[PDB]
UniProtKB/Swiss-Prot annotation:
Job of this protein: Catalyzes the last irreversible step in the biosynthesis of L-serine from carbohydrates, the dephosphorylation of O-phospho-L-serine to L-serine. L-serine can then be used in protein synthesis, to produce other amino acids, in nucleotide metabolism or in glutathione synthesis, or can be racemized to D-serine, a neuromodulator. May also act on O-phospho-D-serine.
Protein name: Phosphoserine phosphatase
Name of the gene this protein is made from: PSPH
Binding partners and assembly: Homodimer.
Disease: Phosphoserine phosphatase deficiency: An autosomal recessive disorder that results in pre- and postnatal growth retardation, moderate psychomotor retardation and facial features suggestive of Williams syndrome.
Activity regulation annotation text: Inhibited by calcium ions.
Effect of S19A: Reduces L-phosphoserine phosphatase activity by about 50%
Binding site for L-serine: D16, V17, D18, S105, G106, G107, K154
The organism of origin for this protein: Homo sapiens (Human)
Keywords: Acetylation, Amino-acid biosynthesis, Cytoplasm, Disease variant, Hydrolase, Magnesium, Metal-binding, Serine biosynthesis
Gene Ontology cellular-component annotations: cytoplasm; cytosol
Family of this protein: Belongs to the HAD-like hydrolase superfamily. SerB family.
Effect of M48T: In PSPHD; decreased L-phosphoserine phosphatase activity
Active site positions: D16, D18
Length: 221
């Protein structure tokens, strides 16, 4: 109930995407589509937390993947990421109370906009990395000016949102240490373990849930 009191005081909620809003890690699923799952999935685990600089870890994984525009399109069409149970209902209840909902990801806007356009979250509220392609569709790099291209990028996004909209109370929700480290500048953090529990987050977060229903413990409508 104290959790729900906190949750209901927020005027903006930012969700991590990989392993929070969706069950999978987008970059790993792209690597699967492109045939380099094993190497990239390992590098993704390697980059967890501030362990290695994020921009370098992103460049190296994409250098192995080399995703074409057609391959990104085929991922979205044939193997779309699975939404975590409860997230559709939770975003719906937040939007019905006019809480501004955002998605923040070190993954890619192509995929995250598809996810947002399952949750009625406008593309303006999506912050993610942007893949580049040549005219023929070949992988051409990524937008290195995005805040999500750098370590600490989630906190930079939240700072931008505070400066643009002056929200009173922004809550960050995510599964990983990089989400926990986005508070501050977020006003509170809720850790999420419904897909995989990151024990260091569970052990140190003030607020932690394993099923989005727990925030749907209000009046259930
Ligand atoms: Mg995550």
């Amino acid at each position: 109930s104290e959790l729900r009191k906190l949750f209901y005081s927020a005027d903006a909620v930012c969700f991590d995407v990989d392993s929070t809003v969706i069950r999978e890690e987008g970059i790993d699923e792209l690597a699967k589509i492109c045939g380099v799952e094993d190497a990239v999935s390992e590098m993704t685990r390697r980059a967890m937390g501030g362990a290695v600089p994020f921009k370098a870890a992103l460049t190296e994984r994409l250098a192995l993947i080399q995703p074409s525009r057609e391959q990104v399109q085929r991922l979205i069409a044939e193997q779309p990421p699975h939404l975590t149970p409860g997230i559709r209902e939770l975003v719906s209840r937040l939007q019905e109370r006019n809480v501004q909902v955002f998605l923040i990801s070190g993954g890619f806007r192509s995929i995250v906009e598809h996810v947002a356009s399952k949750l009625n979250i406008p593309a303006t509220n999506v912050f993610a990395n942007r893949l580049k392609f040549y005219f023929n569709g070949e992988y051409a790099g990524f937008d290195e000016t995005q805040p999500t291209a750098e370590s600490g990028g989630k906190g930079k996004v939240i700072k931008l949102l505070k400066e643009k909209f002056h929200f009173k109370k922004i809550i960050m929700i995510g599964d990983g240490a990089t989400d926990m480290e986005a508070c501050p500048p977020a006003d509170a953090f809720i850790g999420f373990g419904g897909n995989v529990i990151r024990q260091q987050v569970k052990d140190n977060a003030k607020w932690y849930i394993t099923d989005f229903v727990e925030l749907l413990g209000e009046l259930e409508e």
